[PDB]
């Protein structure tokens, strides 16, 4: 093939131009994101039964839904959480690669076939189905900084003036709101209701009657009379549009004649429809917009457009409203990807510099800096075709492929220049000769790299997607590289390369280059002599090799595994969890304390504290809270003590000194649709009959038995909430009937007063809002305020609750949770530092085996994945090894020679492991991909050495030792060029401190170690293997 292009350089230029154009169009037409869809698709059914207890919803809504969650495809598991705030969250997790849309609609329909089984209150409030995997891109804040306008006014202004625009914006998918728009709050007073002998039922009925809509008809409608000339639509009374209108509502007419209104016995307000959650941005009331990115969109352009659209609307805002942008993680994406691109360009430049240092000619260095861009643009095109995006994983795969891209072009050009300098031939015949030497080796190299990088694209779970990204991008790059090297690179080596006479290898040319030539010649002679001496006795080295292998194995077993490194995304989280029976005033005190700490002690590294009171990552109540802390730009946080690790440690140590609270600070992890990903999540289930109490007892027994193995298990904790007090009311019906009281009225009064009641809707400023009816806080605060509530009997005589209440105290759970339709209790844990999660998980299985009857266990989250992806790596790498052996036997036409190439793997693996053990890294994904890269490059080098040796022993009839020596001599230069270029392109990733330091370091450390160790040891050991193998066979 290459001889078809050495005579036709313009056809090769044309192919190159086509690839460049395709890659450019792609680059302009590609998404951009931090990470691809890695977490398995999940869907959340969210419901709300206001003024209810976890048992109430768990019995009336959750069990029902879970029962009707039958007949759905590719369901992997199901969880459910029921809180005392009335909310319900059922989370269905499907297999990977499932088209979340069809699953969402499946579950939505199976639910629509269950709505008639729930009570009218849930149907009224509305059951929603959302996609839970996709997390937020940014969060927009809105504060007052002016005459205090409650957060509800801000939420209404947002929902009415800053939500339609943000949703019409490009790239914006789901747009969620933190607060709720206005609602007609009607706070009733039992005393002013007893005055006029009323109840809340009367208020509810009156509102339902005097805020409804009525269909009337038409004025001259069909069938019409003969002669009719007018048809006009009729409009009867409609919904109301203010508080004054709601005031002029007739509840009664006193015997004397006076008419009772609502203005009298009920305060009327425009307020939020839910106060359970509160938000404060630096001690200022705020509202928030959650923004999600749509499939196939660019995060950077989307965020830019959002910021533009929000700058447009500053003119039209009340005095005292400013957007402040908490939780914006697009800058981290920008910086990481820009740094990777910087790395690619620096590698393109270092290739130039190295080729100039080694060859001393500009026309030869022009060649590799023409080929690598072509291959990168072709890779971009392939990504665009296969429906991929530009993200951290893809771009790091490109970085790791730069090494192979450089290797190919350097090999071609260097061999051609060598031939032209030695045999004095011109560029065309020299290139023909080089290609004849090199093309088969290049094809075998491509197929070997394929066998190495492909089988990782068949792992199962969330890690499979990461490996897929890496594998596909690297394989595309390598394939395009071999195609180019066989198509374009020769076409350029045959035209650009200017001829030079024979005998002119570098001797002379006074200066730094005339000196490097002679130094490299001296080093080449020394290395050749050392190899020749090594080949006199080889057994001395087949033992050092086993020593190296054993060291590699020891380092591999002593290398702690991992999933991904934590980074400094510019934000982190703080978590606040008070004791059982707390309120939200106390939680807000604690949150203001945290805010003061952050804005006073860490004033130099912090910009904001978005404190949300009412929502903790595990539970919803006044007892919980979180705080998003957003830090200044990294350019303004110079230092390691000013990073997120150190800030977190300091804040945790400081908040350890807070009383009646468990305040922690943690770093926003890697991919957020996932979680901590310690590979440890556990669920106890009552598979037969048992209730909550025996299940809690079993949970505590397991925690006790787990605290007795602190050498395998640590921080074994439940994620749920512990039981708290409940105010029981044992109503009696005998007395209630003897007094003529409708139990339904009793319950409606109780609920509407203390819990609330969605009554109807109203229309304000062109929007439909609700109408809630509740009590004035003063009369709900304590049990002694219940006797203050009276019901209307049949005989028109009021009755106090104290006549039948018979109240008590009890203990019950505020958060129940189920796993696959069965009651469950979750448990979070970790493997003791020094062991794997498999040992911990097996131990927990053995412990659960010693639990009471009817209690079983099940794994969720990454643990579930870690029960699938644990038995794949060895099989797939065995497949890789066999395929590589076969490709090499084909390339060399011998079943034994390939071994000389399949023993240079530890020579790079041990370097990678040494570098990782020094820098203090883990066996994460980037490290594995770097390992494969080093293996591939060392295999390139060994393959070419062996091919040169064999071609010399066959064609030129040379011997074994002479051929080996001549091969190593001919191959030393390009090996060093490739190794140096790649080490230099990787150095920044190793010495990086800032945005992306984690992944950059995990990549570069291993890659550099492998490069050094292989470059240095292969050139000594591959000859030994070749000689030994050709002798024993």
């Amino acid at each position: 093939m290459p001889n078809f292009f050495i005579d036709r350089p313009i056809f090769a230029w044309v192919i190159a131009i086509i690839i460049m154009l395709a890659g450019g169009l792609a680059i302009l037409k590609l998404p951009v994101a931090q990470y691809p869809t890695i977490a398995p698709p999940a869907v959340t059914i969210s419901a709300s039964y206001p003024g209810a207890d976890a048992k109430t919803v768990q019995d009336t809504v959750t069990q029902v839904i879970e029962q009707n969650m039958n007949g759905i495809d590719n369901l992997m598991y199901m969880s459910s959480n029921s809180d005392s705030t009335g909310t319900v969250q059922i989370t269905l997790t499907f297999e990977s690669g499932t088209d979340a849309d069809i699953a969402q609609v499946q579950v939505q329909n199976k639910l629509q076939l269950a709505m008639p089984l729930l009570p009218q209150e849930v149907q009224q409030q509305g059951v929603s189905v959302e996609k839970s995997s996709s997390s937020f891109l940014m969060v927009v804040g809105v504060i007052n900084t002016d005459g205090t306008m409650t957060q509800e006014d801000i939420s209404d202004y947002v929902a009415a003036n800053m939500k339609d625009a943000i949703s019409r914006t490009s790239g914006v998918g789901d747009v969620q709101l933190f607060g709720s728009q206005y609602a007609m709050r009607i706070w009733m007073n039992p005393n002013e209701l007893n005055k006029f002998q009323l109840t809340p039922v009367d208020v509810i009925t009156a509102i339902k009657a005097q805020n409804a809509q009525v269909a009337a008809g038409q004025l001259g409608g069909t069938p019409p009379v003969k002669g009719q000339q007018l048809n006009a639509s009729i409009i009867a009374q409609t919904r109301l549009t203010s508080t004054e209108e709601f005031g002029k509502i007739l509840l009664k007419v006193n015997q004397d004649g006076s008419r009772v209104l609502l203005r009298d016995v009920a305060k009327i307000e425009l307020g939020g429809e839910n106060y359970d959650i509160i938000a404060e941005f630096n001690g200022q009331p705020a509202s928030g917009l959650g923004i999600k990115l749509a499939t196939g969109a660019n995060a950077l352009d989307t965020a830019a457009a959002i910021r533009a659209e929000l700058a447009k609307m500053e003119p039209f805002f009340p005095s005292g409203l400013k957007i402040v942008y908490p939780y914006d993680t697009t800058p981290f994406v920008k910086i990481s990807i820009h740094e990777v691109v910087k790395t690619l360009v620096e590698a393109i430049i270092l290739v130039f510099l190295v080729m100039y240092l080694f060859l001393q000619n500009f026309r030869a260095t022009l060649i590799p800096t023409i080929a690598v861009p072509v291959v990168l643009l072709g890779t971009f095109a392939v990504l665009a075709a296969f429906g991929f995006s530009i993200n951290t994983l893809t771009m790091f795969g490109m970085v790791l492929a730069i090494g192979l891209l450089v290797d190919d072009a350097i090999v071609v050009v260097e061999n051609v220049e060598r031939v032209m300098a030695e045999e004095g031939l011109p560029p065309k015949e020299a290139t023909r000769k080089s290609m004849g030497q090199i093309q088969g080796a290049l094809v075998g190299i491509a197929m070997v790299l394929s066998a190495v990088f492909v089988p990782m694209a068949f792992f199962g779970g969330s890690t499979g997607a990461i490996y897929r990204q890496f594998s596909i991008t690297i394989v595309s790059a390598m394939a395009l590289s071999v195609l180019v090297a066989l198509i374009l690179t020769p076409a350029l080596c045959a035209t650009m390369l200017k001829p030079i006479a024979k005998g002119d290898h570098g001797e002379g040319k006074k200066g730094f280059f005339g000196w490097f030539n002679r130094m490299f010649e001296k080093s080449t002679h020394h290395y050749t002599d050392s190899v020749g001496g090594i080949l006199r006795s080889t057994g001395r080295y087949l033992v050092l090799y086993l020593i190296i292998v054993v060291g590699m194995a020891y380092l591999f077993v002593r290398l702690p595994s991992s999933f991904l490194p934590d980074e400094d995304q510019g934000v982190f989280m703080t978590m606040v969890q008070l004791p059982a029976g707390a309120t939200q005033e106390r939680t807000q005190k604690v949150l203001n304390e945290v805010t003061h700490y952050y804005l006073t002690k860490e004033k130099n590294n912090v910009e904001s504290v978005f404190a949300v009171n009412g929502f903790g990552f595990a539970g919803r109540g006044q007892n919980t809270g979180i705080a998003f802390v957003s830090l200044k730009d990294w350019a303004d946080r110079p230092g390691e003590e000013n990073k997120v690790e150190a800030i977190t440690m300091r804040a945790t140590r400081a908040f350890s000194q807070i009383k009646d609270a468990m305040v922690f600070a943690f770093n926003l992890p890697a991919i957020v649709e996932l979680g901590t990903a310690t590979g440890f999540d556990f669920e106890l289930i009552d598979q037969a009959g048992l209730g909550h109490e025996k299940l809690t007892q079993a949970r505590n027994q397991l925690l006790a038995e787990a605290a007795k193995h602190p050498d395998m298990l640590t921080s074994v904790r439940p994620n749920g909430l512990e039981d708290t007090p409940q105010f029981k009311i044992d109503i009696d019906q005998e007395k209630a009937q003897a007094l003529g009281v409708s139990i339904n009225d009793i319950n409606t009064t109780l609920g509407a007063a203390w819990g609330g009641s969605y009554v109807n809707d109203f229309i304000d400023r062109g929007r439909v809002k609700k109408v809630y009816v509740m009590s004035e806080a003063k009369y709900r605060m304590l049990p002694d305020d219940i006797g203050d509530w009276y019901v209307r009997a049949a005989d028109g005589q009021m009755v106090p609750f104290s006549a039948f209440s018979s109240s008590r105290w009890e203990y019950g759970s505020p958060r129940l949770e189920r796993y696959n339709g069965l009651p469950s209790m979750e448990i979070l844990g970790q493997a003791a530092p020094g062991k794997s999660t498999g040992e911990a998980m097996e131990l927990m299985e053995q412990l659960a085996s010693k639990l009471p009857t009817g209690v079983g266990y099940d794994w969720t989250g990454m643990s579930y994945q870690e029960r699938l992806s644990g038995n794949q790596a060895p099989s797939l790498y065995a497949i890789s090894l066999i395929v590589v052996f076969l490709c090499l036997a084909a390339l060399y036409e011998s079943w034994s020679i390939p071994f000389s190439v399949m023993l240079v793997v530890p020579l790079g693996v041990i370097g990678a492991l040494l570098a990782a053990t020094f820098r203090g890294l883990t066996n994460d994904v980037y490290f594995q991909v770097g390992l494969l890269t080093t293996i591939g490059l060392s295999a390139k080098n060994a393959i070419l050495i062996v091919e040169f040796a064999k071609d010399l022993m066959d064609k030129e009839g040379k011997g074994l030792i002479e051929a080996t020596l001549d091969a190593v001599r001919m191959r030393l230069r390009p090996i060093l060029m490739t190794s140096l270029a790649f080490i230099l392109g990787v150095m920044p990733l190793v010495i990086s401190t800032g945005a992306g330091s984690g992944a950059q370091n995990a990549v570069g450390t291993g890659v550099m170690g492998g490069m050094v160790t292989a470059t240095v040891l292969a050139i000594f050991f591959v000859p030994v293997f070749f000689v030994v193998v050709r002798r024993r066979f």
Binding site: G581, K659, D660, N700, P725, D732, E734, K735, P783, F804, S805, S806, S807, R808, W809, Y811
Partner: protein
């Protein structure tokens, strides 16, 4: 309240006896009250912890305490099937015929739940069967409504 009182409440509701003895050594308020008026005795009786009830009544625990509605540890140990705890609270000066803020007695509860051994050991120490709730229903009417016949026989 005080740090040690809160820690002792936590220990009692969780059921750690060694920590209870320790907190007792440091002079903890054995009468420490929760926000709903409960005490370590209330908790150890609710959750059925026995060793803790002993350890408490040995270090000066108030046995006839009462919460914000009048439920002493007997009202709790009665309708949860706790025999040893009832015996202990009785051998230490518990009002076997107390009342809540709604006129309720341990017999009412032991009858509602259908317990018998509790009712027996309560009658032994002077459990007035003929006490009237705030509605006018004694343990006999409760047993008759529950449909339990052996309880009614024991009560007659």
């Amino acid at each position: 309240g005080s740090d040690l009182g809160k820690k002792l409440l936590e220990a009692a509701r969780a059921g750690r006896d060694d920590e209870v003895r320790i907190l007792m050594a440091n002079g903890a308020d054995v009468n420490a009250a929760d926000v709903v008026g409960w005490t370590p005795l209330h908790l150890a009786a609710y959750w059925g912890h026995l060793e803790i009830v002993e350890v408490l009544l040995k270090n000066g625990a108030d046995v006839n305490a009462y919460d914000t509605l009048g439920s002493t540890p007997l009202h709790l140990a009665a309708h949860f099937g706790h025999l040893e705890i009832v015996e202990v609270l009785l051998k230490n000066g518990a009002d076997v015929n107390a009342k809540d803020d709604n006129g309720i007695t341990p017999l009412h509860l032991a009858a509602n739940r259908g317990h018998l051994e509790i009712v027996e050991v309560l009658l032994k120490y002077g459990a007035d069967v003929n006490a009237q709730d705030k509605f006018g229903k004694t343990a006999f009417d409760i047993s008759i409504n529950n449909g339990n016949e052996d309880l009614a026989e024991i009560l007659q």
